[PDB]
């Protein structure tokens, strides 16, 4: 299965005025783990895009969105906002409706004008899954859904948001065979972004 | 005597590629047909000579899902059972 | 003049000069006429004998389209052949989509669109022929005359070519003399006389008279050529009326 | 004049100068004579040599056993038209097993040649052809001209000074059409006709080319030694 | 998914639930399923969700363009025709099933469209996995010339039947009311019968619970 | 749709000094039914060559027609000259391999 | 369309002349809105002038007016709408900003300026619009595809006099109603014939108009900012004038 | 489905049932299966609904264009267009159609186009999954030049039996009467045709 | 077309001393449902040719339209088309065979078997078979479908070889054809009582006897059969 | 010689195309009633050998839309065929009968396309569409070779356009639609304006009348024209 072949996890959460997006670092071919540095979180200005699924499609979409967002930035003279970026990703995913990328993306960011946290998820072919609380994708989608539902609650401040999202990702990954080898959590604010690497089981 | 399906609602979609778009999984590419004279070209006639762990847990087949279904996409049954 | 070296041009008077120069080509063609009956239509045309080497009664100039449409023209003969070929394929297409043979008004519309199209683009020449065509369909007999400009009207009797003026005068006298209309048998002989009178102002050269006609009664609605006994009856009638 | 240079322009008098100059192209070419009886059709051609050291142009093109043609004017246009005629006859044979009737071939060439005289960019074929053949309806002879006009004929001559040959053919029309049961006299009449168009030159074993087709004669071209008996 | 359309004496009301599920999991508890094709033409779809979204976006853009071109309010039948021709062109591979309802100068219209391009006129319709449960209520309680209030109540209660009796349908009820004389009334979460059960404990962790290997500040 | 059949015919070519012999039965078959008693499948091809395309009858007819067309075009071009056996062999090879798949 | 020996594009100047032969059109930016105005001529007293609007909506936030050949403006406008939807909104889910749509329209007209077999468009446009980031905007787009933003501008046969009047009247602290007053005065001074709510027409890029949104119950959607002033609305202002 | 068309003395009566099913579920119980392709030409849809509706729209386009260019078409022209569209796409399409119409020169005419895409004039035609159960009844009860009431009763009885025996047929029996007088919609409810 | 839906079962034909006789039943069957009984499967294309067609009825109507178009286009610019340079049986058959083989090659075959029967202008009988695959052959007797097995032996008993054709008169051949129709009606489940028969004679032209009945049926022995076994 | 700007900014080729509209030398009139729209156009049959039934410039474009053309009949028939194709295309594509003004708009756009592309000449015709719109009621829409079009309260076209226009203006100013109660009355009214403006009395052969009504546009035959003329004489 192209989506299960490489594994990997991505999870996003919204704080009171900040967002957090986190992913595992494992890359492999089913049983065999290949690399522990395959970071699936990409950023284009102030909007962050995490992508699980077939790693070739992850890289291809990273390049495609880098190109498209750079052109947007140049000819608009302003960075693409999370909502506009979500629409761009949705349109680009559906463009290959019959030849789709086998990925699940997850957008996270803060709209610069309104300052409101924003997160959204997708299927293979661009079904927008705008949600107000948290977004989950990857091989451990089930584990992460359960864990985030149990832990998450509204209006988490950045420190407690970090703790909640990190614990959700850690406990979800520890129960997924094709996920792990460390994780990286981004805490995104109106004026800064903090990247942290989590200690966890290496099996 | 079969029932009428005027809307083709229950209409179901060579073997089908399990994951459309990827040629590496295409049946004609995953299992290509041998040459008509491969028997004379190689001695024995051939150019060449799982999931689930210890716990017994108990995807859909693209050949019995409706044409609009994309494997791994979000799909809501239009008419129910 | 100017504004007449190209086809897709209007002169300051709003005149397409190239189309008029094409019309003047028709005025140099041999006379051809058509006459409507009570139950059919008749076609006739002059065929000038340039020399005795021509094989008699084999160089035909009247053409059938499908089976019920007859076409005759004057001017650049190959242009008329081109137009008849297009008409034939249009009739075939109509008979393919639908099944009734293409109605004469529908065929006239198709030919008018094709000929008028040639007057739109700089890259293509207007037709150098004025074609008289008609036939029999579910609504009786129709007769149309189509000009190089693409304009066409339904006619009771039509004549085109060098002798068109005297032929038109005699056709007027014809329709005046026969208020109750003509029969096919009468009209064959009448058209022979009209053609013979038309040649009289073009009598510098010998000619052969070709006649054709379509009628509900005498062909059961199919286009056919005048031959043998009836042809000779028409010839003697025409010569007697000229003598 | 300003209307001469394009094929899609009528003159103010309605003439197509660009086609009449194609007719002049045939008027440039050498004479070729054709004539027929009820059973045989004959072609006679006076070939040309560029120099005393040079061979003569072949002016007779054989289509197949029942049909062939001769040339007057631009030879390459004759190549094109003849290969198109070959394509049409071959298509007829493959798709119907049917011998393409000579009148059908004549009108097909007419239709093809007409196209160049109406659309811009095309050039009228600067070659005229005499086509002979024998089919289920007897022997035939056709005259093809650049304008597209195709004419069925008892006899004719196209090329330089062909008017004398045509005059002789018109004079003797009542005679040669009667020729029956033998091709020799028909070929003799043809060579007599073509001889009318010779100035400072005479028919010779190298100038002359003769062809014939008929009931008992598949299309054959006589040249060199074979034509010596007729010169 | 559970959609219902209900024509009443002076318009049509289209309603849907809000639960969105991927597999057996509730991906979103408050998914908005009613989509504008125009101010007074609204649709809700089943089947492949992404295809429904893309096709409704396409038809809405084309219809707004056409309305600007003709300087006329869109006809519901125009959307029906365009949508059905587009779906037919792909021979059902788009997999979009829709109930399209709206109001236009010709009256109040309610249609359904299927992935292969077939369409139906109706006075009450249902769609989605909860189609049968909602249609049971619609059949039991629908009548000629319902008032707007009765129509809203009937559509809401059919959607509630689908919510209570179908697994792939739940959470809240969305309702949109199109009426002949005036603008459409979109009622987001018209009913909220499934409020969240309260937590027994706050599972917040004391800061420092997680172990961190590295920390960095990113130059965005 | 299976586009092929087998009409059950046999051909035999033998060569020696001074002569060549091509023999074949006239029986025509479809499954266990006799289509016709006399359907020649060895043909006098002119130019002192004899041809047969035994096997599936429709493809035999098609290939024979194509070869007739090709040899006639060879006559059109090369001034009605006699076609050699090796030239015919190469022509038929190119005809056959033109439909490799 | 080729360079002349003097470096000028030959046929573009003729398109500019055609624009100069067109009727006067105006644009004025207030601090809180934009006004675009133009007089509409009539072919005859029998013609229903209310059938044709020289001002037209491109996007709910962008509107356009023109001087020059009307049919060219009409085809350019529906081309502009087509590009604004297919090329931008189909992708980003939002309407293009005034700058982007002006750029696309300029590209449409410039293609004719740089392609054979087609003459340049004979219309100059004033494209008023609004953005959440760039704010209010007013652009003049010429037949050559050259477009420049203006505080206030006029095009058509009255271009120079209207421009010299706007230069006097315009200031950095105009509100939208003051801009409408100035536009009415300027266009009245340029109309040689009858001047009333049916010969003049106005449109404004101002605050949100939820009354025109056509539906209710979505707090996020705002409604068109472009709106035409009806004949009665203009008559009210001319009476109060 | 139970489609039926019967020519009679003053014209042709076209009739059908209103039930549409997706498997065992009645997805639509009051659907109208009779379509007005032209003023006096009506077709009935059988087989795939999508294919039949696409064919109907294409035929309406072609016949409108035919009416504008060549005058009013006949029933035969309409059915010929149906035939060409069905045949040139017979592999993709899965539609069987009955075409009925009234033209003064021919009075009422009926053509049936089975799934193969062939054209047949018949005094009367029955189509749909429910027709199989009324072949014998219609064959033994049809008569030439029936009166309007006789034809209405005949169609009523035939479709009543077809609805009785076919699970895929049911609902109201609708008929359209094509005659020189005009076109008349007729509707008969289950308690009316089931108590026959 | 990939599958035949409505089909005509069988056509038989034989050549006699002066021409060819050909017959076919008027029934088109929708599977086992004998749906359409008025179909005409003998297609005259002139006074010297008649074309019998089997298989898919829609493809048969398409082929009939092709033959009508052949006749129409042959008369264009053909002043002799009514007496010579008219369409021979050979031309019709060759065009049909070319079309059938081409359709086969494009994997879009006409599911028909076609017997073109007639007489050439020289008086020689023409009788050839062509099917969907493009397979063509000639024989003194031809049959399609169950006729190739049931009827064809009966006809061959009359004219077993080319030497027997001049010995076979009109009456003998017609009796053989009618007996073959009776046998096929007995044993072919797709067959019908009504059939059309066409006779092309080098002297008297095309005779086309439509809607003939199968007669002299033998059933009176059925009263003695008492089921399986006892 | 081609549709490109002269230094004056004028398109001389399009202006020449306008002048071609008067070649036929026939006048036309369209008027709106309360519930109907009427067309009056001169039928001039110069040759007695013509069939008068086939000499026509009024075209039935769709069930509801009628069209009237001034200018050469070949271009008129080309435009009529194009309009019929556009109407059928709209009915197929958007599922409802084409509005009259929307057809006017696409025809104007198509004419404008020729006014810009040098490949093809403009059509030397002026089209007048008439309908009783499903929403907007009676409609008249005159179209120009320049791609310009506009709705009209009443319309006249031809060599003597100005006289008919003046008469219509005077009538309207002395009274937006004609107060008559049936379509025959308004047809007679328009015929009287033709009689007065042109100072000529028409025979039943000299007039063409197309009447647009709900779901029916139809052209009056010769005897119906005679009925209207005698009603005027009454």
PDB file of N, CA and C in Angstrom, chain A residues 97-155:
ATOM      1  N   UNK A  97      -6.723  13.876 -10.062  1.00  0.00           N
ATOM      2  CA  UNK A  97      -7.807  13.057  -9.531  1.00  0.00           C
ATOM      3  C   UNK A  97      -7.651  11.580  -9.867  1.00  0.00           C
ATOM      4  N   UNK A  98      -7.263  11.272 -11.100  1.00  0.00           N
ATOM      5  CA  UNK A  98      -7.186   9.890 -11.552  1.00  0.00           C
ATOM      6  C   UNK A  98      -5.782   9.307 -11.442  1.00  0.00           C
ATOM      7  N   UNK A  99      -4.791  10.128 -11.100  1.00  0.00           N
ATOM      8  CA  UNK A  99      -3.424   9.694 -10.926  1.00  0.00           C
ATOM      9  C   UNK A  99      -2.835  10.215  -9.629  1.00  0.00           C
ATOM     10  N   UNK A 100      -3.612  10.161  -8.553  1.00  0.00           N
ATOM     11  CA  UNK A 100      -3.323  10.989  -7.379  1.00  0.00           C
ATOM     12  C   UNK A 100      -2.036  10.611  -6.660  1.00  0.00           C
ATOM     13  N   UNK A 101      -1.456  11.622  -6.013  1.00  0.00           N
ATOM     14  CA  UNK A 101      -0.433  11.393  -5.004  1.00  0.00           C
ATOM     15  C   UNK A 101      -1.022  10.623  -3.830  1.00  0.00           C
ATOM     16  N   UNK A 102      -0.262   9.659  -3.319  1.00  0.00           N
ATOM     17  CA  UNK A 102      -0.698   8.845  -2.186  1.00  0.00           C
ATOM     18  C   UNK A 102      -0.158   9.454  -0.892  1.00  0.00           C
ATOM     19  N   UNK A 103      -0.742  10.597  -0.530  1.00  0.00           N
ATOM     20  CA  UNK A 103      -0.294  11.378   0.613  1.00  0.00           C
ATOM     21  C   UNK A 103      -1.502  11.836   1.414  1.00  0.00           C
ATOM     22  N   UNK A 104      -1.263  12.111   2.691  1.00  0.00           N
ATOM     23  CA  UNK A 104      -2.190  12.881   3.481  1.00  0.00           C
ATOM     24  C   UNK A 104      -1.501  14.108   4.041  1.00  0.00           C
ATOM     25  N   UNK A 105      -1.807  15.278   3.492  1.00  0.00           N
ATOM     26  CA  UNK A 105      -1.233  16.516   4.028  1.00  0.00           C
ATOM     27  C   UNK A 105      -2.006  17.051   5.224  1.00  0.00           C
ATOM     28  N   UNK A 106      -1.348  17.961   5.941  1.00  0.00           N
ATOM     29  CA  UNK A 106      -1.935  18.642   7.089  1.00  0.00           C
ATOM     30  C   UNK A 106      -1.371  20.054   7.144  1.00  0.00           C
ATOM     31  N   UNK A 107      -2.229  21.050   6.991  1.00  0.00           N
ATOM     32  CA  UNK A 107      -1.810  22.446   7.010  1.00  0.00           C
ATOM     33  C   UNK A 107      -2.004  23.000   8.412  1.00  0.00           C
ATOM     34  N   UNK A 108      -1.063  23.832   8.850  1.00  0.00           N
ATOM     35  CA  UNK A 108      -1.150  24.498  10.139  1.00  0.00           C
ATOM     36  C   UNK A 108      -0.484  25.859  10.038  1.00  0.00           C
ATOM     37  N   UNK A 109      -1.096  26.860  10.656  1.00  0.00           N
ATOM     38  CA  UNK A 109      -0.535  28.197  10.628  1.00  0.00           C
ATOM     39  C   UNK A 109      -1.451  29.167  11.336  1.00  0.00           C
ATOM     40  N   UNK A 110      -1.028  30.427  11.342  1.00  0.00           N
ATOM     41  CA  UNK A 110      -1.787  31.521  11.935  1.00  0.00           C
ATOM     42  C   UNK A 110      -1.978  32.579  10.862  1.00  0.00           C
ATOM     43  N   UNK A 111      -3.230  32.915  10.570  1.00  0.00           N
ATOM     44  CA  UNK A 111      -3.511  33.958   9.594  1.00  0.00           C
ATOM     45  C   UNK A 111      -2.925  35.275  10.090  1.00  0.00           C
ATOM     46  N   UNK A 112      -2.062  35.886   9.275  1.00  0.00           N
ATOM     47  CA  UNK A 112      -1.311  37.048   9.735  1.00  0.00           C
ATOM     48  C   UNK A 112      -2.220  38.231  10.037  1.00  0.00           C
ATOM     49  N   UNK A 113      -3.259  38.445   9.230  1.00  0.00           N
ATOM     50  CA  UNK A 113      -4.134  39.592   9.441  1.00  0.00           C
ATOM     51  C   UNK A 113      -5.022  39.389  10.663  1.00  0.00           C
ATOM     52  N   UNK A 114      -5.829  38.326  10.660  1.00  0.00           N
ATOM     53  CA  UNK A 114      -6.730  38.069  11.776  1.00  0.00           C
ATOM     54  C   UNK A 114      -6.012  37.518  13.000  1.00  0.00           C
ATOM     55  N   UNK A 115      -4.882  36.838  12.816  1.00  0.00           N
ATOM     56  CA  UNK A 115      -4.172  36.257  13.938  1.00  0.00           C
ATOM     57  C   UNK A 115      -4.820  35.027  14.527  1.00  0.00           C
ATOM     58  N   UNK A 116      -5.718  34.380  13.794  1.00  0.00           N
ATOM     59  CA  UNK A 116      -6.482  33.250  14.308  1.00  0.00           C
ATOM     60  C   UNK A 116      -5.786  31.940  13.956  1.00  0.00           C
ATOM     61  N   UNK A 117      -5.614  31.023  14.907  1.00  0.00           N
ATOM     62  CA  UNK A 117      -5.045  29.715  14.572  1.00  0.00           C
ATOM     63  C   UNK A 117      -5.868  29.008  13.504  1.00  0.00           C
ATOM     64  N   UNK A 118      -5.178  28.294  12.618  1.00  0.00           N
ATOM     65  CA  UNK A 118      -5.820  27.577  11.524  1.00  0.00           C
ATOM     66  C   UNK A 118      -5.112  26.251  11.292  1.00  0.00           C
ATOM     67  N   UNK A 119      -5.898  25.189  11.122  1.00  0.00           N
ATOM     68  CA  UNK A 119      -5.380  23.872  10.774  1.00  0.00           C
ATOM     69  C   UNK A 119      -6.392  23.177   9.874  1.00  0.00           C
ATOM     70  N   UNK A 120      -5.892  22.314   8.992  1.00  0.00           N
ATOM     71  CA  UNK A 120      -6.753  21.586   8.074  1.00  0.00           C
ATOM     72  C   UNK A 120      -6.046  20.325   7.602  1.00  0.00           C
ATOM     73  N   UNK A 121      -6.841  19.332   7.202  1.00  0.00           N
ATOM     74  CA  UNK A 121      -6.335  18.071   6.713  1.00  0.00           C
ATOM     75  C   UNK A 121      -6.943  17.708   5.368  1.00  0.00           C
ATOM     76  N   UNK A 122      -6.382  16.661   4.768  1.00  0.00           N
ATOM     77  CA  UNK A 122      -6.738  16.285   3.408  1.00  0.00           C
ATOM     78  C   UNK A 122      -6.735  14.769   3.271  1.00  0.00           C
ATOM     79  N   UNK A 123      -7.404  14.297   2.223  1.00  0.00           N
ATOM     80  CA  UNK A 123      -7.286  12.928   1.751  1.00  0.00           C
ATOM     81  C   UNK A 123      -6.386  12.900   0.514  1.00  0.00           C
ATOM     82  N   UNK A 124      -6.318  11.735  -0.134  1.00  0.00           N
ATOM     83  CA  UNK A 124      -5.459  11.581  -1.305  1.00  0.00           C
ATOM     84  C   UNK A 124      -5.741  12.634  -2.366  1.00  0.00           C
ATOM     85  N   UNK A 125      -7.010  12.972  -2.575  1.00  0.00           N
ATOM     86  CA  UNK A 125      -7.442  13.783  -3.705  1.00  0.00           C
ATOM     87  C   UNK A 125      -8.106  15.086  -3.258  1.00  0.00           C
ATOM     88  N   UNK A 126      -7.649  15.660  -2.149  1.00  0.00           N
ATOM     89  CA  UNK A 126      -7.940  17.051  -1.863  1.00  0.00           C
ATOM     90  C   UNK A 126      -9.252  17.350  -1.179  1.00  0.00           C
ATOM     91  N   UNK A 127      -9.809  16.407  -0.424  1.00  0.00           N
ATOM     92  CA  UNK A 127     -11.008  16.707   0.349  1.00  0.00           C
ATOM     93  C   UNK A 127     -10.619  17.542   1.564  1.00  0.00           C
ATOM     94  N   UNK A 128     -11.045  18.804   1.607  1.00  0.00           N
ATOM     95  CA  UNK A 128     -10.663  19.679   2.709  1.00  0.00           C
ATOM     96  C   UNK A 128     -11.331  19.192   3.985  1.00  0.00           C
ATOM     97  N   UNK A 129     -10.553  19.099   5.062  1.00  0.00           N
ATOM     98  CA  UNK A 129     -11.077  18.620   6.335  1.00  0.00           C
ATOM     99  C   UNK A 129     -10.858  19.680   7.409  1.00  0.00           C
ATOM    100  N   UNK A 130     -11.253  20.916   7.117  1.00  0.00           N
ATOM    101  CA  UNK A 130     -11.097  22.009   8.067  1.00  0.00           C
ATOM    102  C   UNK A 130     -11.702  21.628   9.414  1.00  0.00           C
ATOM    103  N   UNK A 131     -10.899  21.726  10.473  1.00  0.00           N
ATOM    104  CA  UNK A 131     -11.334  21.402  11.825  1.00  0.00           C
ATOM    105  C   UNK A 131     -10.780  22.439  12.790  1.00  0.00           C
ATOM    106  N   UNK A 132     -11.479  22.634  13.904  1.00  0.00           N
ATOM    107  CA  UNK A 132     -11.171  23.706  14.840  1.00  0.00           C
ATOM    108  C   UNK A 132     -10.301  23.265  16.010  1.00  0.00           C
ATOM    109  N   UNK A 133     -10.124  21.959  16.225  1.00  0.00           N
ATOM    110  CA  UNK A 133      -9.457  21.467  17.429  1.00  0.00           C
ATOM    111  C   UNK A 133      -8.117  20.819  17.108  1.00  0.00           C
ATOM    112  N   UNK A 134      -8.079  19.792  16.264  1.00  0.00           N
ATOM    113  CA  UNK A 134      -6.828  19.115  15.956  1.00  0.00           C
ATOM    114  C   UNK A 134      -7.001  18.277  14.700  1.00  0.00           C
ATOM    115  N   UNK A 135      -5.882  17.999  14.036  1.00  0.00           N
ATOM    116  CA  UNK A 135      -5.865  17.240  12.794  1.00  0.00           C
ATOM    117  C   UNK A 135      -4.858  16.109  12.936  1.00  0.00           C
ATOM    118  N   UNK A 136      -5.180  14.969  12.335  1.00  0.00           N
ATOM    119  CA  UNK A 136      -4.382  13.757  12.466  1.00  0.00           C
ATOM    120  C   UNK A 136      -4.245  13.104  11.099  1.00  0.00           C
ATOM    121  N   UNK A 137      -3.049  12.601  10.802  1.00  0.00           N
ATOM    122  CA  UNK A 137      -2.823  11.847   9.578  1.00  0.00           C
ATOM    123  C   UNK A 137      -1.666  10.883   9.797  1.00  0.00           C
ATOM    124  N   UNK A 138      -1.612   9.856   8.962  1.00  0.00           N
ATOM    125  CA  UNK A 138      -0.533   8.888   8.982  1.00  0.00           C
ATOM    126  C   UNK A 138      -1.029   7.483   9.275  1.00  0.00           C
ATOM    127  N   UNK A 139      -0.063   6.576   9.441  1.00  0.00           N
ATOM    128  CA  UNK A 139      -0.393   5.183   9.722  1.00  0.00           C
ATOM    129  C   UNK A 139      -1.050   5.026  11.087  1.00  0.00           C
ATOM    130  N   UNK A 140      -0.719   5.898  12.038  1.00  0.00           N
ATOM    131  CA  UNK A 140      -1.292   5.868  13.378  1.00  0.00           C
ATOM    132  C   UNK A 140      -2.458   6.834  13.521  1.00  0.00           C
ATOM    133  N   UNK A 141      -3.221   7.037  12.447  1.00  0.00           N
ATOM    134  CA  UNK A 141      -4.357   7.948  12.507  1.00  0.00           C
ATOM    135  C   UNK A 141      -5.318   7.555  13.623  1.00  0.00           C
ATOM    136  N   UNK A 142      -5.575   6.255  13.779  1.00  0.00           N
ATOM    137  CA  UNK A 142      -6.497   5.803  14.819  1.00  0.00           C
ATOM    138  C   UNK A 142      -5.954   6.099  16.212  1.00  0.00           C
ATOM    139  N   UNK A 143      -4.703   5.709  16.468  1.00  0.00           N
ATOM    140  CA  UNK A 143      -4.105   5.956  17.774  1.00  0.00           C
ATOM    141  C   UNK A 143      -4.125   7.443  18.091  1.00  0.00           C
ATOM    142  N   UNK A 144      -3.728   8.267  17.120  1.00  0.00           N
ATOM    143  CA  UNK A 144      -3.651   9.703  17.348  1.00  0.00           C
ATOM    144  C   UNK A 144      -5.030  10.304  17.582  1.00  0.00           C
ATOM    145  N   UNK A 145      -6.037   9.877  16.819  1.00  0.00           N
ATOM    146  CA  UNK A 145      -7.385  10.379  17.057  1.00  0.00           C
ATOM    147  C   UNK A 145      -7.807  10.102  18.489  1.00  0.00           C
ATOM    148  N   UNK A 146      -7.672   8.850  18.930  1.00  0.00           N
ATOM    149  CA  UNK A 146      -8.072   8.528  20.291  1.00  0.00           C
ATOM    150  C   UNK A 146      -7.299   9.326  21.323  1.00  0.00           C
ATOM    151  N   UNK A 147      -5.981   9.418  21.148  1.00  0.00           N
ATOM    152  CA  UNK A 147      -5.138  10.067  22.142  1.00  0.00           C
ATOM    153  C   UNK A 147      -5.434  11.561  22.223  1.00  0.00           C
ATOM    154  N   UNK A 148      -5.499  12.234  21.072  1.00  0.00           N
ATOM    155  CA  UNK A 148      -5.794  13.662  21.056  1.00  0.00           C
ATOM    156  C   UNK A 148      -7.186  13.945  21.601  1.00  0.00           C
ATOM    157  N   UNK A 149      -8.171  13.114  21.248  1.00  0.00           N
ATOM    158  CA  UNK A 149      -9.506  13.304  21.799  1.00  0.00           C
ATOM    159  C   UNK A 149      -9.478  13.215  23.318  1.00  0.00           C
ATOM    160  N   UNK A 150      -8.709  12.269  23.861  1.00  0.00           N
ATOM    161  CA  UNK A 150      -8.641  12.140  25.313  1.00  0.00           C
ATOM    162  C   UNK A 150      -7.922  13.324  25.953  1.00  0.00           C
ATOM    163  N   UNK A 151      -6.823  13.781  25.350  1.00  0.00           N
ATOM    164  CA  UNK A 151      -5.982  14.796  25.978  1.00  0.00           C
ATOM    165  C   UNK A 151      -6.407  16.222  25.649  1.00  0.00           C
ATOM    166  N   UNK A 152      -6.707  16.508  24.385  1.00  0.00           N
ATOM    167  CA  UNK A 152      -6.914  17.887  23.958  1.00  0.00           C
ATOM    168  C   UNK A 152      -8.095  18.523  24.677  1.00  0.00           C
ATOM    169  N   UNK A 153      -7.946  19.798  25.012  1.00  0.00           N
ATOM    170  CA  UNK A 153      -9.045  20.637  25.457  1.00  0.00           C
ATOM    171  C   UNK A 153      -8.787  22.065  25.006  1.00  0.00           C
ATOM    172  N   UNK A 154      -9.831  22.884  24.903  1.00  0.00           N
ATOM    173  CA  UNK A 154      -9.687  24.186  24.240  1.00  0.00           C
ATOM    174  C   UNK A 154      -8.771  25.140  24.991  1.00  0.00           C
ATOM    175  N   UNK A 155      -8.249  26.109  24.235  1.00  0.00           N
ATOM    176  CA  UNK A 155      -7.528  27.255  24.790  1.00  0.00           C
ATOM    177  C   UNK A 155      -6.303  26.828  25.594  1.00  0.00           C
TER     178      UNK A 155
END
